[PDB]
Amino acid sequence: NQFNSAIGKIQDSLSSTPSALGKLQDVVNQNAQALNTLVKQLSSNFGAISSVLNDILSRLDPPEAEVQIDRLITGRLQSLQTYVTQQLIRAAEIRASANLAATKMSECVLGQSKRVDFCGKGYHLMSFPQSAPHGVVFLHVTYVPAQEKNFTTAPAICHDGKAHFPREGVFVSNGTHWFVTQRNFYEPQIITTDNTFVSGNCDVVIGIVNNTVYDPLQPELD
C-alpha cells in the first residue's frame, strides 16, 4: 500500500515538480551557449578589420587581404580549439559521472548495497532505473523506520553466576521485564536460553543485572 502510494506520490510531484531535473536542462543550455558563442565568433573580427573575408576579396588585393585573413584565421583557430577544450572538459565530467552511474546501477539496481546514501538516503531497499532523452534516472526505494519508543537495555544478565549474552539479539525491559527484540525494529520474543548464549561469568561486566533466562527443558520431564 505504501509502496504504490509512494509511486503515486512521485507521480504527482514529477508532473508538478519544477527544478527537479534542472541539471540536464543546464547541460543542453550549456552546450547551446558553447556553440552559439562559437557562431557569434565566426561573425567576429578577432582583431580583424571586418568579420567577413568575402568583402575583402571583392575589394582588396592578395597581400593585404591574406594578412587580414591570417589574423582572421588565427582567431578562428583558437576559437575552435578552445571550443574543443571546453567540450572535452565537459566530456571528462560526463565520463566521471558515467562511471559513477554505472556503479550506481551495479550496486542499487543489480544488487543490494550496504553503502550509505550511495543508493539514496535511508535504509536501502531498491532502485528502479528510468531513462531520459539524454540520461537515465534511478527511482531509489529505501526504508525508514518509525515510532521510536524508549526502553532500557542490558548487555547480559547475571544468572547461574553467568552472564548469558545475546547470540543475535538485545534485551530490553518495558518497565519490569525483559523481552528479546532485534536491534532496529521492535520485534520482541521472550528472553530464553535458546535465543541467547553464555560465555563466562558476570563478575566483570558493567551494566549487567540479575534475572532469569527461561529454559524449555524441565517440561520435557513431564
Partner: protein
Amino acid sequence: MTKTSVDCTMYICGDSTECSNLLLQYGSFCTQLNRALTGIAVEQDKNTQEVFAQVKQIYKTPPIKDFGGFNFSQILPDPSKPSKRSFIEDLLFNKVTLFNGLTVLPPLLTDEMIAQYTSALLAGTITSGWTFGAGAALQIPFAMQMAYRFNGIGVTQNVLYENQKLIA
C-alpha cells in the same frame, strides 16, 4: 579551491576605452572566461554543499559528556568559544600560513559553519554511528553501538565489554 573574482578587461589593458574598441573588435573571449570562472565558483559552492550539507538536522550534544569516561577536551568544540573549534582544528587553522583590481572572494561557508556542521555530524555519529546516514540520529550508549559493529564483523559485544575500560 579558492573562488576567484576577475575584473578581466582592466587586467587585459587597464583603463583604455580605445582598448575596449579593440577588444569588442576582437570578440568576447574574456566573456567565455568569465562563464568558465563562474562555473568553477558554482561547482565548488556545490562541492562544499554536498560535502557538508549531508544532514537536514542540526544535532546538539547534551551538557552531559558521558561517553564512557572519555576525555575529549582537545578534539571537540571548546565551550570557551574560540570559534568552537577543537584544539586540533586550532592547529589545522594555525597550520595554514597565507590586490590590483584582481581580488579573491571569501569562502561561502565560513569556518563557523563548517565547524557546527561538523559538530552536528559528530553528534549524529557518536549517538548513532550509521543510523543517521540511514535516517535520524538514534540514541545508543556507544557500548552497544560498537556491539552492533562487531556484529557487522561477526564478533560479540562481550569482547569490548570485557576490556571496554582498556579499549577506552
